[PDB]
Design a protein around this nucleic acid. Structure first.
Lengths: 117, 133
RNA sequence: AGUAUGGGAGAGGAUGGUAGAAUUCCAGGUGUAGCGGUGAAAUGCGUAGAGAUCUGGAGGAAUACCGAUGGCGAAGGCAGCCAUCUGGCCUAAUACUGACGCUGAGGUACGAAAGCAUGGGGAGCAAACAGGAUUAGAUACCCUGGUAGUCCAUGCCGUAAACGAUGUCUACUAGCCGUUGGGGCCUUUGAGGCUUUAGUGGCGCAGCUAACGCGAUAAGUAGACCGCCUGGGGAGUACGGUCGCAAGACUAAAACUCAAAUGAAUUGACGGGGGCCCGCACAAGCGGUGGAGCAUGUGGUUUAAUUCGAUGCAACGCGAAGAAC
């Protein structure tokens, strides 16, 4: 409805769950998708096979606005980090830049204790 | 282990298909059914079956198979590549059951019917073969 | 052994000022049904509006790379940047006092974390506490909430695997390969190369050791002094005495019991121990059992007996290749 066509994308990839959000350059949300609404409801949501579909269902909803300027921002390591862009490139989205924006803290608070088992 | 081609048509594919239809070593009753189905399908179109059976089987020939590998307690189903011989074996095992699934007078007539149905695409032998699966 | 001179390195210490990132909280914009977690689920949050993103504030801790086989310090200990005070060490010989040195029972100072007292603060983390799981039981390992503390300033406490499990000082005794601060020499011809010290590493000769190993930073050969040990448990415990707000700290036995308690190494075994290998062992394909009926054996009840054996794989179409006499 805006037809701005310069919306960035935020792919937050984690070991537990991944999130895709196509927003505008300013930051207002336009189309977001999660693995929860997919229907796996478990650790299978962390698989890249689910992350690619979660990114595609968001890309198809963002296509209603006519987005073709893709600026990707990835946060957090884990599986499914590469499946998002490999799924978005299959539909034919034009890519402008790919970089790592995962924030590393500079001497923050105390991390939790290491899991023994 | 290599098999000899049939003495009638000099084709090893027909011999391997007979080895897949044959049960309990009854080569005679399998050869009879195969020859009857061939002569029946030759009546719909006067075509030598050695040219048409290959087309019909490649119409249903699969590409990849899905097997499970245990790593951490999950299935993790992924497709894998195999030699074409395994795919022909799968196709033959798919055709030998689709003909029996039908209801007709003799096995030769229903086999010819299922083969003709899978030729044009109305048979279930190609339906059971799925790409995503 | 020490003094003054000109130079060099250093998380050495005390005081004061200052900043980024990150976490949490407080609003604002778009948006919003799932978010969070376990090998699996929930306790928890949210349609008031979940999660994520952007923008402005609030306060607390530390300072990602540099970072090292680093460096400084008597030990504990010391890492963001800047200003002041101050300590120690190294390097070149010039003169100087001329044995002025080492050790050191009592004594004294410093002394990890935790804790105690006094006035504040408290972001995150978290003893004790609550809820949700597994287990026959879970009181704990797991997750979700959370109080002291972790922080600042002033005192008490003097305790740790405060370990290099190796007291301080001095002189001697083959070598090979790196690092740190200096100096000198050779063509600084080039961050070059070679030697002398002061620290910090890895092998190794001889020698020592029961073995493991040490081996110019000795556990080798030698000297001076201090401390400490006389089988194990009892027991660093009772009593006593000193210190202390307390916790407790220091000094420190006896009765009794046993014929053991130890360190290293060898050969096996184990191992949920990291590999390696193989196995119709796991993968794949085909056909059965387990469902029905019958033959056969065994197990249980009964009778006069239902003759006796065989009992996980390795007993059960077994002894028996064949009970109407």
């Amino acid at each position: 409805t805006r037809t701005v066509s310069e919306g960035v994308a935020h792919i937050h990839a984690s070991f537990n769950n991944t999130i895709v959000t196509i927003t505008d350059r300013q930051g207002n949300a336009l189309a977001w998708a999660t693995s929860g609404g997919q229907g796996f409801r478990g650790s299978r949501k962390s698989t890249p096979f689910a992350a690619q579909v979660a990114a595609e269902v968001a890309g198809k909803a963002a296509l209603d606005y006519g987005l073709k300027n893709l600026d990707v921002l990835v946060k957090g390591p884990g599986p499914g980090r590469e499946s998002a862009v490999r799924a978005l490139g299959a539909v034919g989205y034009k890519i402008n830049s790919i970089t790592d924006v995962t924030p590393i803290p500079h001497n923050g608070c105390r991390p939790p204790k290491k899991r023994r088992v | 282990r290599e098999i000899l081609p049939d003495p009638k048509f000099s084709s090893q594919t027909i011999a391997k298909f007979m080895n897949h239809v044959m049960q309990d070593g009854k080569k005679s009753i399998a050869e009879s059914i195969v020859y009857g189905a061939l002569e029946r399908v030759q009546e719909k179109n006067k075509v030598d079956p050695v040219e048409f059976f290959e087309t019909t089987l490649e119409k249903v020939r699969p590409m990849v198979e899905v097997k499970a590998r245990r790593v951490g307690g999950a299935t993790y189903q992924v497709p894998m590549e195999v030699r074409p011989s395994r795919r022909t074996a799968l196709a033959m095992r798919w055709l030998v059951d689709a003909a029996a699934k039908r209801s007709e007078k003799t096995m030769a007539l229903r086999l010819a019917g299922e083969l003709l149905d899978a030729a044009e695409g109305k048979g279930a032998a190609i339906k059971k073969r799925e790409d995503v699966h």
